[PDB]
Amino acid sequence: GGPSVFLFPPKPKDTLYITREPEVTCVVVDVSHEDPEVKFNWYVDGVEVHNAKTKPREEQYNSTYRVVSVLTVLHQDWLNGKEYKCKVSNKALPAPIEKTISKAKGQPREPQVYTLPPSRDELTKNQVSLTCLVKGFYPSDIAVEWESNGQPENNYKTTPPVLDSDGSFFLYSKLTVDKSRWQQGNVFSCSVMHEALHNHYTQKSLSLS
Amino acid sequence: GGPSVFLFPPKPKDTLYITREPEVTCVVVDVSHEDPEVKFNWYVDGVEVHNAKTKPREEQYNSTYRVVSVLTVLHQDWLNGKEYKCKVSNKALPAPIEKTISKAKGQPREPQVYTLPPSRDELTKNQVSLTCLVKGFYPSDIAVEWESNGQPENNYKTTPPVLDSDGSFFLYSKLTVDKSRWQQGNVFSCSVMHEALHNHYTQKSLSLS
Numbered sequence: 001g002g003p004s005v006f007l008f009p010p011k012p013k014d015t016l017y018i019t020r021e022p023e024v025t026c027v028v029v030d031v032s033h034e035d036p037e038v039k040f041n042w043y044v045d046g047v048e049v050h051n052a053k054t055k056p057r058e059e060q061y062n063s064t065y066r067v068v069s070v071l072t073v074l075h076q077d078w079l080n081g082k083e084y085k086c087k088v089s090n091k092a093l094p095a096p097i098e099k100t101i102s103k104a105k106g107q108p109r110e111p112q113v114y115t116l117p118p119s120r121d122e123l124t125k126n127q128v129s130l131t132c133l134v135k136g137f138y139p140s141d142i143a144v145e146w147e148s149n150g151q152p153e154n155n156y157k158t159t160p161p162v163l164d165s166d167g168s169f170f171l172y173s174k175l176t177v178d179k180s181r182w183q184q185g186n187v188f189s190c191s192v193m194h195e196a197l198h199n200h201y202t203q204k205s206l207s208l209s
Numbered sequence: 210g211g212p213s214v215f216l217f218p219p220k221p222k223d224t225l226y227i228t229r230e231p232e233v234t235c236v237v238v239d240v241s242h243e244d245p246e247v248k249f250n251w252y253v254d255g256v257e258v259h260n261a262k263t264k265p266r267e268e269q270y271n272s273t274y275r276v277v278s279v280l281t282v283l284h285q286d287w288l289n290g291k292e293y294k295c296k297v298s299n300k301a302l303p304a305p306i307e308k309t310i311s312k313a314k315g316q317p318r319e320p321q322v323y324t325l326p327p328s329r330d331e332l333t334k335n336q337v338s339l340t341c342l343v344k345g346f347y348p349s350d351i352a353v354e355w356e357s358n359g360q361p362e363n364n365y366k367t368t369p370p371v372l373d374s375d376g377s378f379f380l381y382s383k384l385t386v387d388k389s390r391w392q393q394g395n396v397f398s399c400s401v402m403h404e405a406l407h408n409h410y411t412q413k414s415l416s417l418s
């Protein structure tokens with residue numbers, strides 16, 4: 001009936017490098033037409049901070065508006081698991097709605113990255129699958145990417161993290177390339193970005209034998 | 210605002226074998242403690258059916274009833290894409306609630322199935338990963354299982370299906386085995402069940418080269 005809040009974490013990549021600007025994000029939907037005024041409050045471990053940046057209002061094709069507030073956060077505060085609260089206010093609610101979010105708790109575990117060449121079966125096609133396996137990792141927050149000769153590779157998909165029997169995580173990422181490119185010996189690389197890696201980064205390479 | 214409905218599909222495995230019994234399950238929750246009486250109507254392609262089988266009272270701990278109706282479906286009807294609709298009637302609600310479920314539309318596409326041995330770099334550990342790449346398949350309904358010397362294998366996990374770039378789906382399945390088992394030359398088998406496979410079934414195997 002009333003407005004509903006939704007609280008998102010920052011991207012895996014953004015928390016792992018000073019280069020990047022990680023953010024938590026409070027999205028309110030079903031903001032009433034008659035009362036449009038939404039007030040956001042942000043707290044780190046209960047202690048209020050103030051740098052949230054409320055953004056305009058995106059009117060939705062169902063009568064209601066959508067108000068998004070973005071809190072910037074320090075890399076190490078998220079990595080150290082500090083707790084982030086969004087309190088949202090509006091006259092279409094009797095009480096203010098709150099949401100709290102934080103990194104998954106627990107000893108981080110270093111991912112193990114193994115690359116696997118195409119199956120002999122598959123070498124009968126005009127495209128081949130280069131596979132990257134990332135297992136053993138915790139928390140589930142990770143980024144994976146591909147490249148050749150310094151250049152980002154376009155055509156890959158990566159599975160979501162899957163919970164493994166030992167409570168750690170794994171995924172597979174698939175890069176699709178022209179068989180010729182594989183046949184001609186070009187070197188392809190799997191880039192994995194996780195908290196528990198040295199410099200939050202590792203890169204594993206694969207090429208024709 | 211009172212009761213809510215959820216409509217779950219049959220299990221992929223269940224629709225592909227006469228041997229199995231696929232069902233569609235309508236679940237109504239949050240039922241007014243005052244008035245306990247929910248009335249189910251079922252429809253197959255608009256046309257009412259009556260072989261539905263409704264159960265009694267699963268009042269979960271909250272002070273509200275849960276009622277489950279199960280419609281037994283014919284294997285061919287599901288694969289032909291027949292629509293199943295659950296109407297839940299109640300004096301609390303003004304209009305009765307409707308939910309519909311079916312097999313995703315599109316032209317079905319045959320999965321290619323490829324087994325990938327453990328990376329050279331993994332073989333230093335005591336447990337190793339046998340990988341099964343299933344790709345090129347539509348719709349996303351599929352099942353994957355492992356076995357060796359005719360016996361279901363214990364320790365695998367399968368990623369959810371992932372929408373690939375050509376609108377087909379792919380997944381990977383990982384079977385973990387002790388290194389020895391792999392080194393003794395044991396054959397291991399990925400088995401995939403999908404509507405677009407011949408006899409709804411293919412098996413692809415894997416051993417030490």
Ligand SMILES: *C1O[C@H](CO[C@H]2O[C@@H](C)[C@@H](O)[C@@H](O)[C@@H]2O)[C@@H](O[C@@H]2O[C@H](CO)[C@@H](O[C@@H]3O[C@H](CO[C@H]4O[C@H](CO)[C@@H](O)[C@H](O)[C@@H]4O[C@@H]4O[C@H](CO)[C@@H](O)[C@H](O)[C@H]4NC(C)=O)[C@@H](O)[C@H](O[C@H]4O[C@H](CO)[C@@H](O)[C@H](O)[C@@H]4O[C@@H]4O[C@H](CO)[C@@H](O)[C@H](O)[C@H]4NC(C)=O)[C@@H]3O)[C@H](O)[C@H]2NC(C)=O)[C@H](O)[C@H]1NC(C)=O
Pocket residue numbers: 215217218234236238239269270271273275
């Ligand atoms: C009293 O409690 C009730 C439940 O018992 C609770 O007891 C307490 C003590 C505690 O133990 C709790 O943990 C217990 O849950 C409350 O009822 C619950 O209500 C919530 C929602 O408020 C229901 O949530 C839905 O759940 C489904 C998934 O349900 C499966 O898994 C559940 C466990 O994870 C299980 O409980 C269910 O039984 C069910 O199991 C399946 O059962 C079928 C048939 O029996 C089997 O064939 C399956 O194998 C089996 N699955 C397996 C395995 O578990 C979830 O999918 C629903 O999500 C949809 O809806 C959301 C909105 O409601 C939406 O946000 C989601 O995106 C999603 O919507 C759909 O998403 C896809 C996208 O592709 C599309 O299908 C649609 O586009 C989209 N549809 C839309 C728009 O809706 C949903 O979250 C919960 O299941 C239910 N519990 C039971 C039991 O049924 C009750 O509210 C409470 N009372 C009060 C007053 O508070």
Ligand SMILES: *[C@@H]1O[C@H](CO[C@H]2O[C@@H](C)[C@@H](O)[C@@H](O)[C@@H]2O)[C@@H](O[C@@H]2O[C@H](CO)[C@@H](O[C@@H]3O[C@H](CO[C@H]4O[C@H](CO)[C@@H](O)[C@H](O)[C@@H]4O[C@@H]4O[C@H](CO)[C@@H](O)[C@H](O)[C@H]4NC(C)=O)[C@@H](O)[C@H](O[C@H]4O[C@H](CO)[C@@H](O)[C@H](O)[C@@H]4O[C@@H]4O[C@H](CO)[C@@H](O)[C@H](O)[C@H]4NC(C)=O)[C@@H]3O)[C@H](O)[C@H]2NC(C)=O)[C@H](O)[C@H]1NC(C)=O
Pocket residue numbers: 004006008009025027029030060061062064066
């Ligand atoms: C009027 O329009 C509104 C918006 O526009 C609509 O336009 C129409 C034309 C059509 O296009 C629609 O499809 C559009 O939605 C509607 O608003 C919607 O309201 C619903 C709630 O009813 C929202 O549903 C929730 O979605 C979140 C996930 O949101 C992300 O993913 C969406 C795609 O799947 C995406 O569209 C969203 O924008 C959002 O994207 C993310 O954004 C962040 C921040 O910017 C980015 O940084 C991310 O990268 C980006 N993600 C990417 C990438 O996809 C989902 O999480 C919610 O599920 C939770 O809550 C359910 C009930 O509230 C519950 O049933 C679920 O089980 C689930 O509950 C949580 O489960 C997690 C699991 O781990 C736990 O962590 C929690 O414990 C648990 N939480 C609790 C307490 O329940 C939910 O599905 C929808 O997002 C929103 N649309 C957008 C967009 O904002 C409005 O409904 C519509 N009215 C109608 C009906 O006409």
